């Protein structure tokens, strides 16, 4: 909703990716597009700083980051893929939070950050849902 006859050939989205590809070369995967939207889809599976991790990571979620054409102007579509251990409830929170970070970091690089948050979030709700019913309420 903004008359945009023409802008500039600048994009920070890629400027940040070129770096991430070096750090999370494998820890994260990036995808390119074509056409007008040419949305860049990126995936990554974060894990808690739990001890057992040393061997295996029971809980894990492939943080999906879909960077549209507007980006950064437009926050990347955040979605939890292959949510292990986490429940519909927990997952819901992860998204809401992760999203907040983006909206707050609009116009500027956020992807990198958005990812970090995911790690922390889980760290807290690492343990799987036990007894049915929220203790607090």
């Amino acid at each position: 909703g903004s008359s945009g006859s023409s802008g500039e050939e600048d994009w920070v989205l890629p400027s940040e990716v070129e770096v991430l590809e070096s750090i999370y070369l494998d820890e994260l995967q990036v995808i390119k597009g074509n056409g007008r939207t040419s949305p860049w889809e990126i995936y990554i599976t974060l894990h808690p700083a739990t001890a057992e991790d040393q061997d295996s990571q029971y809980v894990c979620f492939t943080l999906v980051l879909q960077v549209p054409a507007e980006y950064p102007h437009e926050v990347p579509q955040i979605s939890i893929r292959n949510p292990r251990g986490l429940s519909d409830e927990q997952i819901h929170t992860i998204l809401q939070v992760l999203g907040h970070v983006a909206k707050a970091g609009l116009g500027t690089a956020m992807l990198y950050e958005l990812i970090e948050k995911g790690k922390e979030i889980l760290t807290d709700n690492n343990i799987p849902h036990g007894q049915s019913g929220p203790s607090s309420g």
Side-chain angles (χ1 to χ4, degrees), residues 47-69:
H47 307 280
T50 52
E52 272 59 70
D53 209 282
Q54 61 164 300
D55 277 59
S56 288
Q57 45 286 118
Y58 157 54
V59 61
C60 65
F61 68 105
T62 300
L63 211 176
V64 178
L65 292 154
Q66 202 209 300
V67 179

mmCIF file with all atom_site columns, all heavy atoms in Angstrom, residues 47-69:
data_model
loop_
_atom_site.group_PDB
_atom_site.id
_atom_site.type_symbol
_atom_site.label_atom_id
_atom_site.label_alt_id
_atom_site.label_comp_id
_atom_site.label_asym_id
_atom_site.label_entity_id
_atom_site.label_seq_id
_atom_site.pdbx_PDB_ins_code
_atom_site.Cartn_x
_atom_site.Cartn_y
_atom_site.Cartn_z
_atom_site.occupancy
_atom_site.B_iso_or_equiv
_atom_site.pdbx_formal_charge
_atom_site.auth_seq_id
_atom_site.auth_comp_id
_atom_site.auth_asym_id
_atom_site.auth_atom_id
_atom_site.pdbx_PDB_model_num
ATOM 1   N N   . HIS A 1 47 ? 19.161 -25.757 18.465 1.00 0.00 ? 47 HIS A N   1
ATOM 2   C CA  . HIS A 1 47 ? 19.152 -26.733 19.548 1.00 0.00 ? 47 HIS A CA  1
ATOM 3   C C   . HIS A 1 47 ? 19.534 -26.078 20.873 1.00 0.00 ? 47 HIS A C   1
ATOM 4   O O   . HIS A 1 47 ? 20.349 -25.157 20.925 1.00 0.00 ? 47 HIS A O   1
ATOM 5   C CB  . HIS A 1 47 ? 20.114 -27.881 19.237 1.00 0.00 ? 47 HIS A CB  1
ATOM 6   C CG  . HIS A 1 47 ? 19.879 -28.513 17.900 1.00 0.00 ? 47 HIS A CG  1
ATOM 7   N ND1 . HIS A 1 47 ? 18.883 -29.439 17.670 1.00 0.00 ? 47 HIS A ND1 1
ATOM 8   C CD2 . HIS A 1 47 ? 20.517 -28.347 16.718 1.00 0.00 ? 47 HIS A CD2 1
ATOM 9   C CE1 . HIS A 1 47 ? 18.920 -29.816 16.405 1.00 0.00 ? 47 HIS A CE1 1
ATOM 10  N NE2 . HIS A 1 47 ? 19.901 -29.168 15.805 1.00 0.00 ? 47 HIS A NE2 1
ATOM 11  N N   . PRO A 1 48 ? 18.934 -26.565 21.969 1.00 0.00 ? 48 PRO A N   1
ATOM 12  C CA  . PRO A 1 48 ? 19.195 -26.043 23.313 1.00 0.00 ? 48 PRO A CA  1
ATOM 13  C C   . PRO A 1 48 ? 20.595 -26.388 23.808 1.00 0.00 ? 48 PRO A C   1
ATOM 14  O O   . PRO A 1 48 ? 21.240 -27.300 23.288 1.00 0.00 ? 48 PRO A O   1
ATOM 15  C CB  . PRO A 1 48 ? 18.137 -26.735 24.175 1.00 0.00 ? 48 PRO A CB  1
ATOM 16  C CG  . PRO A 1 48 ? 17.813 -27.991 23.441 1.00 0.00 ? 48 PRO A CG  1
ATOM 17  C CD  . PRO A 1 48 ? 17.953 -27.664 21.980 1.00 0.00 ? 48 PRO A CD  1
ATOM 18  N N   . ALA A 1 49 ? 21.061 -25.656 24.814 1.00 0.00 ? 49 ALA A N   1
ATOM 19  C CA  . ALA A 1 49 ? 22.383 -25.887 25.380 1.00 0.00 ? 49 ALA A CA  1
ATOM 20  C C   . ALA A 1 49 ? 22.346 -26.994 26.428 1.00 0.00 ? 49 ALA A C   1
ATOM 21  O O   . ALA A 1 49 ? 23.165 -27.022 27.348 1.00 0.00 ? 49 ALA A O   1
ATOM 22  C CB  . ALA A 1 49 ? 22.931 -24.604 25.986 1.00 0.00 ? 49 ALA A CB  1
ATOM 23  N N   . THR A 1 50 ? 21.391 -27.907 26.284 1.00 0.00 ? 50 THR A N   1
ATOM 24  C CA  . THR A 1 50 ? 21.245 -29.016 27.219 1.00 0.00 ? 50 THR A CA  1
ATOM 25  C C   . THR A 1 50 ? 22.470 -29.923 27.191 1.00 0.00 ? 50 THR A C   1
ATOM 26  O O   . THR A 1 50 ? 23.207 -29.957 26.206 1.00 0.00 ? 50 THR A O   1
ATOM 27  C CB  . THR A 1 50 ? 19.992 -29.855 26.906 1.00 0.00 ? 50 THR A CB  1
ATOM 28  O OG1 . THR A 1 50 ? 19.988 -30.233 25.525 1.00 0.00 ? 50 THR A OG1 1
ATOM 29  C CG2 . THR A 1 50 ? 18.725 -29.076 27.226 1.00 0.00 ? 50 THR A CG2 1
ATOM 30  N N   . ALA A 1 51 ? 22.682 -30.657 28.278 1.00 0.00 ? 51 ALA A N   1
ATOM 31  C CA  . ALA A 1 51 ? 23.816 -31.567 28.376 1.00 0.00 ? 51 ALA A CA  1
ATOM 32  C C   . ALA A 1 51 ? 23.671 -32.734 27.406 1.00 0.00 ? 51 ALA A C   1
ATOM 33  O O   . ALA A 1 51 ? 24.506 -32.928 26.525 1.00 0.00 ? 51 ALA A O   1
ATOM 34  C CB  . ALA A 1 51 ? 23.961 -32.079 29.802 1.00 0.00 ? 51 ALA A CB  1
ATOM 35  N N   . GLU A 1 52 ? 22.603 -33.508 27.575 1.00 0.00 ? 52 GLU A N   1
ATOM 36  C CA  . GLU A 1 52 ? 22.350 -34.658 26.713 1.00 0.00 ? 52 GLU A CA  1
ATOM 37  C C   . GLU A 1 52 ? 22.735 -34.350 25.270 1.00 0.00 ? 52 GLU A C   1
ATOM 38  O O   . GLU A 1 52 ? 23.150 -35.238 24.524 1.00 0.00 ? 52 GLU A O   1
ATOM 39  C CB  . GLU A 1 52 ? 20.875 -35.060 26.784 1.00 0.00 ? 52 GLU A CB  1
ATOM 40  C CG  . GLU A 1 52 ? 20.563 -36.031 27.910 1.00 0.00 ? 52 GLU A CG  1
ATOM 41  C CD  . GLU A 1 52 ? 20.922 -35.477 29.275 1.00 0.00 ? 52 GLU A CD  1
ATOM 42  O OE1 . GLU A 1 52 ? 20.235 -34.540 29.736 1.00 0.00 ? 52 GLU A OE1 1
ATOM 43  O OE2 . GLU A 1 52 ? 21.890 -35.979 29.884 1.00 0.00 ? 52 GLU A OE2 1
ATOM 44  N N   . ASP A 1 53 ? 22.597 -33.088 24.882 1.00 0.00 ? 53 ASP A N   1
ATOM 45  C CA  . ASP A 1 53 ? 22.931 -32.662 23.528 1.00 0.00 ? 53 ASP A CA  1
ATOM 46  C C   . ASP A 1 53 ? 24.252 -33.275 23.076 1.00 0.00 ? 53 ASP A C   1
ATOM 47  O O   . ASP A 1 53 ? 24.363 -33.780 21.959 1.00 0.00 ? 53 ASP A O   1
ATOM 48  C CB  . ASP A 1 53 ? 23.012 -31.136 23.455 1.00 0.00 ? 53 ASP A CB  1
ATOM 49  C CG  . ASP A 1 53 ? 22.652 -30.602 22.082 1.00 0.00 ? 53 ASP A CG  1
ATOM 50  O OD1 . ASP A 1 53 ? 23.507 -30.677 21.175 1.00 0.00 ? 53 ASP A OD1 1
ATOM 51  O OD2 . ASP A 1 53 ? 21.517 -30.110 21.915 1.00 0.00 ? 53 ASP A OD2 1
ATOM 52  N N   . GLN A 1 54 ? 25.251 -33.228 23.952 1.00 0.00 ? 54 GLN A N   1
ATOM 53  C CA  . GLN A 1 54 ? 26.566 -33.778 23.641 1.00 0.00 ? 54 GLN A CA  1
ATOM 54  C C   . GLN A 1 54 ? 26.443 -35.018 22.763 1.00 0.00 ? 54 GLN A C   1
ATOM 55  O O   . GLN A 1 54 ? 27.277 -35.257 21.889 1.00 0.00 ? 54 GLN A O   1
ATOM 56  C CB  . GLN A 1 54 ? 27.314 -34.124 24.930 1.00 0.00 ? 54 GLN A CB  1
ATOM 57  C CG  . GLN A 1 54 ? 26.615 -35.174 25.777 1.00 0.00 ? 54 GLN A CG  1
ATOM 58  C CD  . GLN A 1 54 ? 27.525 -35.775 26.830 1.00 0.00 ? 54 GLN A CD  1
ATOM 59  O OE1 . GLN A 1 54 ? 28.556 -36.367 26.511 1.00 0.00 ? 54 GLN A OE1 1
ATOM 60  N NE2 . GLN A 1 54 ? 27.147 -35.625 28.094 1.00 0.00 ? 54 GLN A NE2 1
ATOM 61  N N   . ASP A 1 55 ? 25.398 -35.804 22.999 1.00 0.00 ? 55 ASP A N   1
ATOM 62  C CA  . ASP A 1 55 ? 25.166 -37.020 22.229 1.00 0.00 ? 55 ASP A CA  1
ATOM 63  C C   . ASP A 1 55 ? 24.101 -36.792 21.160 1.00 0.00 ? 55 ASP A C   1
ATOM 64  O O   . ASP A 1 55 ? 24.385 -36.857 19.964 1.00 0.00 ? 55 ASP A O   1
ATOM 65  C CB  . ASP A 1 55 ? 24.741 -38.162 23.154 1.00 0.00 ? 55 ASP A CB  1
ATOM 66  C CG  . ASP A 1 55 ? 25.924 -38.848 23.809 1.00 0.00 ? 55 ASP A CG  1
ATOM 67  O OD1 . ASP A 1 55 ? 26.685 -38.163 24.526 1.00 0.00 ? 55 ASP A OD1 1
ATOM 68  O OD2 . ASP A 1 55 ? 26.088 -40.069 23.606 1.00 0.00 ? 55 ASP A OD2 1
ATOM 69  N N   . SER A 1 56 ? 22.877 -36.524 21.601 1.00 0.00 ? 56 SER A N   1
ATOM 70  C CA  . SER A 1 56 ? 21.768 -36.291 20.682 1.00 0.00 ? 56 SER A CA  1
ATOM 71  C C   . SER A 1 56 ? 20.877 -35.158 21.183 1.00 0.00 ? 56 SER A C   1
ATOM 72  O O   . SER A 1 56 ? 20.927 -34.787 22.356 1.00 0.00 ? 56 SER A O   1
ATOM 73  C CB  . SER A 1 56 ? 20.943 -37.567 20.510 1.00 0.00 ? 56 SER A CB  1
ATOM 74  O OG  . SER A 1 56 ? 21.645 -38.529 19.743 1.00 0.00 ? 56 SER A OG  1
ATOM 75  N N   . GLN A 1 57 ? 20.060 -34.615 20.286 1.00 0.00 ? 57 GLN A N   1
ATOM 76  C CA  . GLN A 1 57 ? 19.158 -33.524 20.637 1.00 0.00 ? 57 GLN A CA  1
ATOM 77  C C   . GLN A 1 57 ? 17.703 -33.936 20.435 1.00 0.00 ? 57 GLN A C   1
ATOM 78  O O   . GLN A 1 57 ? 17.164 -33.823 19.333 1.00 0.00 ? 57 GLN A O   1
ATOM 79  C CB  . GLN A 1 57 ? 19.471 -32.285 19.797 1.00 0.00 ? 57 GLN A CB  1
ATOM 80  C CG  . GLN A 1 57 ? 19.694 -32.588 18.324 1.00 0.00 ? 57 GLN A CG  1
ATOM 81  C CD  . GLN A 1 57 ? 21.029 -33.254 18.061 1.00 0.00 ? 57 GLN A CD  1
ATOM 82  O OE1 . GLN A 1 57 ? 21.087 -34.388 17.582 1.00 0.00 ? 57 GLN A OE1 1
ATOM 83  N NE2 . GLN A 1 57 ? 22.113 -32.554 18.371 1.00 0.00 ? 57 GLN A NE2 1
ATOM 84  N N   . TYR A 1 58 ? 17.075 -34.413 21.503 1.00 0.00 ? 58 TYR A N   1
ATOM 85  C CA  . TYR A 1 58 ? 15.683 -34.844 21.442 1.00 0.00 ? 58 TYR A CA  1
ATOM 86  C C   . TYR A 1 58 ? 14.801 -33.752 20.844 1.00 0.00 ? 58 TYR A C   1
ATOM 87  O O   . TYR A 1 58 ? 14.041 -33.995 19.907 1.00 0.00 ? 58 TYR A O   1
ATOM 88  C CB  . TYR A 1 58 ? 15.180 -35.214 22.839 1.00 0.00 ? 58 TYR A CB  1
ATOM 89  C CG  . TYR A 1 58 ? 13.678 -35.134 22.982 1.00 0.00 ? 58 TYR A CG  1
ATOM 90  C CD1 . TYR A 1 58 ? 12.840 -35.823 22.114 1.00 0.00 ? 58 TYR A CD1 1
ATOM 91  C CD2 . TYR A 1 58 ? 13.096 -34.369 23.984 1.00 0.00 ? 58 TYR A CD2 1
ATOM 92  C CE1 . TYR A 1 58 ? 11.465 -35.752 22.241 1.00 0.00 ? 58 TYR A CE1 1
ATOM 93  C CE2 . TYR A 1 58 ? 11.723 -34.292 24.120 1.00 0.00 ? 58 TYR A CE2 1
ATOM 94  C CZ  . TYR A 1 58 ? 10.912 -34.986 23.246 1.00 0.00 ? 58 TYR A CZ  1
ATOM 95  O OH  . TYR A 1 58 ? 9.544  -34.912 23.377 1.00 0.00 ? 58 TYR A OH  1
ATOM 96  N N   . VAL A 1 59 ? 14.908 -32.547 21.395 1.00 0.00 ? 59 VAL A N   1
ATOM 97  C CA  . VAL A 1 59 ? 14.121 -31.416 20.917 1.00 0.00 ? 59 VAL A CA  1
ATOM 98  C C   . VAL A 1 59 ? 14.856 -30.663 19.812 1.00 0.00 ? 59 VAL A C   1
ATOM 99  O O   . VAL A 1 59 ? 16.050 -30.384 19.927 1.00 0.00 ? 59 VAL A O   1
ATOM 100 C CB  . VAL A 1 59 ? 13.794 -30.437 22.061 1.00 0.00 ? 59 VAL A CB  1
ATOM 101 C CG1 . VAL A 1 59 ? 15.072 -29.872 22.662 1.00 0.00 ? 59 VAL A CG1 1
ATOM 102 C CG2 . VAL A 1 59 ? 12.890 -29.319 21.561 1.00 0.00 ? 59 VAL A CG2 1
ATOM 103 N N   . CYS A 1 60 ? 14.135 -30.338 18.745 1.00 0.00 ? 60 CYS A N   1
ATOM 104 C CA  . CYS A 1 60 ? 14.719 -29.617 17.619 1.00 0.00 ? 60 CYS A CA  1
ATOM 105 C C   . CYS A 1 60 ? 13.631 -29.077 16.697 1.00 0.00 ? 60 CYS A C   1
ATOM 106 O O   . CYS A 1 60 ? 12.621 -29.741 16.454 1.00 0.00 ? 60 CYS A O   1
ATOM 107 C CB  . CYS A 1 60 ? 15.662 -30.532 16.835 1.00 0.00 ? 60 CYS A CB  1
ATOM 108 S SG  . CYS A 1 60 ? 14.840 -31.934 16.043 1.00 0.00 ? 60 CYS A SG  1
ATOM 109 N N   . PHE A 1 61 ? 13.842 -27.869 16.186 1.00 0.00 ? 61 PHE A N   1
ATOM 110 C CA  . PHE A 1 61 ? 12.877 -27.238 15.293 1.00 0.00 ? 61 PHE A CA  1
ATOM 111 C C   . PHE A 1 61 ? 13.586 -26.519 14.148 1.00 0.00 ? 61 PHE A C   1
ATOM 112 O O   . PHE A 1 61 ? 14.509 -25.735 14.368 1.00 0.00 ? 61 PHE A O   1
ATOM 113 C CB  . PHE A 1 61 ? 12.003 -26.248 16.067 1.00 0.00 ? 61 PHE A CB  1
ATOM 114 C CG  . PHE A 1 61 ? 12.753 -25.042 16.557 1.00 0.00 ? 61 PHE A CG  1
ATOM 115 C CD1 . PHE A 1 61 ? 12.608 -23.818 15.927 1.00 0.00 ? 61 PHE A CD1 1
ATOM 116 C CD2 . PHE A 1 61 ? 13.602 -25.135 17.648 1.00 0.00 ? 61 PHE A CD2 1
ATOM 117 C CE1 . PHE A 1 61 ? 13.296 -22.706 16.376 1.00 0.00 ? 61 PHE A CE1 1
ATOM 118 C CE2 . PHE A 1 61 ? 14.292 -24.027 18.101 1.00 0.00 ? 61 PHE A CE2 1
ATOM 119 C CZ  . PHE A 1 61 ? 14.140 -22.811 17.464 1.00 0.00 ? 61 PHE A CZ  1
ATOM 120 N N   . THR A 1 62 ? 13.147 -26.794 12.924 1.00 0.00 ? 62 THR A N   1
ATOM 121 C CA  . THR A 1 62 ? 13.739 -26.177 11.743 1.00 0.00 ? 62 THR A CA  1
ATOM 122 C C   . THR A 1 62 ? 13.170 -24.783 11.508 1.00 0.00 ? 62 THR A C   1
ATOM 123 O O   . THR A 1 62 ? 12.265 -24.599 10.692 1.00 0.00 ? 62 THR A O   1
ATOM 124 C CB  . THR A 1 62 ? 13.505 -27.033 10.485 1.00 0.00 ? 62 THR A CB  1
ATOM 125 O OG1 . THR A 1 62 ? 14.099 -28.325 10.653 1.00 0.00 ? 62 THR A OG1 1
ATOM 126 C CG2 . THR A 1 62 ? 14.090 -26.357 9.254  1.00 0.00 ? 62 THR A CG2 1
ATOM 127 N N   . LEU A 1 63 ? 13.706 -23.802 12.227 1.00 0.00 ? 63 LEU A N   1
ATOM 128 C CA  . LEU A 1 63 ? 13.252 -22.422 12.096 1.00 0.00 ? 63 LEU A CA  1
ATOM 129 C C   . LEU A 1 63 ? 13.236 -21.990 10.633 1.00 0.00 ? 63 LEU A C   1
ATOM 130 O O   . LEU A 1 63 ? 14.286 -21.836 10.009 1.00 0.00 ? 63 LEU A O   1
ATOM 131 C CB  . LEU A 1 63 ? 14.154 -21.488 12.905 1.00 0.00 ? 63 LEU A CB  1
ATOM 132 C CG  . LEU A 1 63 ? 13.484 -20.242 13.484 1.00 0.00 ? 63 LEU A CG  1
ATOM 133 C CD1 . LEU A 1 63 ? 14.466 -19.456 14.339 1.00 0.00 ? 63 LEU A CD1 1
ATOM 134 C CD2 . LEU A 1 63 ? 12.926 -19.369 12.369 1.00 0.00 ? 63 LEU A CD2 1
ATOM 135 N N   . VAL A 1 64 ? 12.037 -21.795 10.092 1.00 0.00 ? 64 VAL A N   1
ATOM 136 C CA  . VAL A 1 64 ? 11.884 -21.377 8.703  1.00 0.00 ? 64 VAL A CA  1
ATOM 137 C C   . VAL A 1 64 ? 11.817 -19.859 8.590  1.00 0.00 ? 64 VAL A C   1
ATOM 138 O O   . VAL A 1 64 ? 11.048 -19.206 9.298  1.00 0.00 ? 64 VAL A O   1
ATOM 139 C CB  . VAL A 1 64 ? 10.618 -21.985 8.071  1.00 0.00 ? 64 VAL A CB  1
ATOM 140 C CG1 . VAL A 1 64 ? 10.454 -21.506 6.637  1.00 0.00 ? 64 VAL A CG1 1
ATOM 141 C CG2 . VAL A 1 64 ? 10.669 -23.504 8.131  1.00 0.00 ? 64 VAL A CG2 1
ATOM 142 N N   . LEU A 1 65 ? 12.626 -19.301 7.696  1.00 0.00 ? 65 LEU A N   1
ATOM 143 C CA  . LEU A 1 65 ? 12.657 -17.858 7.488  1.00 0.00 ? 65 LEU A CA  1
ATOM 144 C C   . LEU A 1 65 ? 12.463 -17.515 6.015  1.00 0.00 ? 65 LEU A C   1
ATOM 145 O O   . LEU A 1 65 ? 13.381 -17.657 5.209  1.00 0.00 ? 65 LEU A O   1
ATOM 146 C CB  . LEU A 1 65 ? 13.984 -17.280 7.987  1.00 0.00 ? 65 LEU A CB  1
ATOM 147 C CG  . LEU A 1 65 ? 14.205 -17.317 9.499  1.00 0.00 ? 65 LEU A CG  1
ATOM 148 C CD1 . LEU A 1 65 ? 15.691 -17.328 9.821  1.00 0.00 ? 65 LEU A CD1 1
ATOM 149 C CD2 . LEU A 1 65 ? 13.522 -16.133 10.167 1.00 0.00 ? 65 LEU A CD2 1
ATOM 150 N N   . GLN A 1 66 ? 11.262 -17.060 5.672  1.00 0.00 ? 66 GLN A N   1
ATOM 151 C CA  . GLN A 1 66 ? 10.947 -16.695 4.295  1.00 0.00 ? 66 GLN A CA  1
ATOM 152 C C   . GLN A 1 66 ? 11.065 -15.188 4.092  1.00 0.00 ? 66 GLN A C   1
ATOM 153 O O   . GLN A 1 66 ? 10.198 -14.425 4.519  1.00 0.00 ? 66 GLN A O   1
ATOM 154 C CB  . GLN A 1 66 ? 9.538  -17.164 3.930  1.00 0.00 ? 66 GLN A CB  1
ATOM 155 C CG  . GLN A 1 66 ? 9.319  -17.325 2.435  1.00 0.00 ? 66 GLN A CG  1
ATOM 156 C CD  . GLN A 1 66 ? 7.876  -17.096 2.028  1.00 0.00 ? 66 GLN A CD  1
ATOM 157 O OE1 . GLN A 1 66 ? 6.972  -17.798 2.482  1.00 0.00 ? 66 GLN A OE1 1
ATOM 158 N NE2 . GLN A 1 66 ? 7.654  -16.108 1.168  1.00 0.00 ? 66 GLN A NE2 1
ATOM 159 N N   . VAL A 1 67 ? 12.141 -14.766 3.437  1.00 0.00 ? 67 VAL A N   1
ATOM 160 C CA  . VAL A 1 67 ? 12.371 -13.351 3.176  1.00 0.00 ? 67 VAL A CA  1
ATOM 161 C C   . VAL A 1 67 ? 11.726 -12.922 1.862  1.00 0.00 ? 67 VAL A C   1
ATOM 162 O O   . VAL A 1 67 ? 12.171 -13.289 0.775  1.00 0.00 ? 67 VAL A O   1
ATOM 163 C CB  . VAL A 1 67 ? 13.875 -13.026 3.126  1.00 0.00 ? 67 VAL A CB  1
ATOM 164 C CG1 . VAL A 1 67 ? 14.095 -11.549 2.831  1.00 0.00 ? 67 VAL A CG1 1
ATOM 165 C CG2 . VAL A 1 67 ? 14.551 -13.423 4.430  1.00 0.00 ? 67 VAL A CG2 1
ATOM 166 N N   . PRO A 1 68 ? 10.651 -12.126 1.964  1.00 0.00 ? 68 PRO A N   1
ATOM 167 C CA  . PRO A 1 68 ? 9.922  -11.629 0.793  1.00 0.00 ? 68 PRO A CA  1
ATOM 168 C C   . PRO A 1 68 ? 10.727 -10.606 -0.001 1.00 0.00 ? 68 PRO A C   1
ATOM 169 O O   . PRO A 1 68 ? 11.925 -10.434 0.225  1.00 0.00 ? 68 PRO A O   1
ATOM 170 C CB  . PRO A 1 68 ? 8.679  -10.974 1.401  1.00 0.00 ? 68 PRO A CB  1
ATOM 171 C CG  . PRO A 1 68 ? 9.087  -10.598 2.783  1.00 0.00 ? 68 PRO A CG  1
ATOM 172 C CD  . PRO A 1 68 ? 10.066 -11.649 3.228  1.00 0.00 ? 68 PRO A CD  1
ATOM 173 N N   . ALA A 1 69 ? 10.061 -9.928  -0.930 1.00 0.00 ? 69 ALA A N   1
ATOM 174 C CA  . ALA A 1 69 ? 10.716 -8.920  -1.756 1.00 0.00 ? 69 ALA A CA  1
ATOM 175 C C   . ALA A 1 69 ? 10.829 -7.593  -1.014 1.00 0.00 ? 69 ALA A C   1
ATOM 176 O O   . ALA A 1 69 ? 11.789 -6.846  -1.204 1.00 0.00 ? 69 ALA A O   1
ATOM 177 C CB  . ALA A 1 69 ? 9.958  -8.734  -3.062 1.00 0.00 ? 69 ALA A CB  1
#
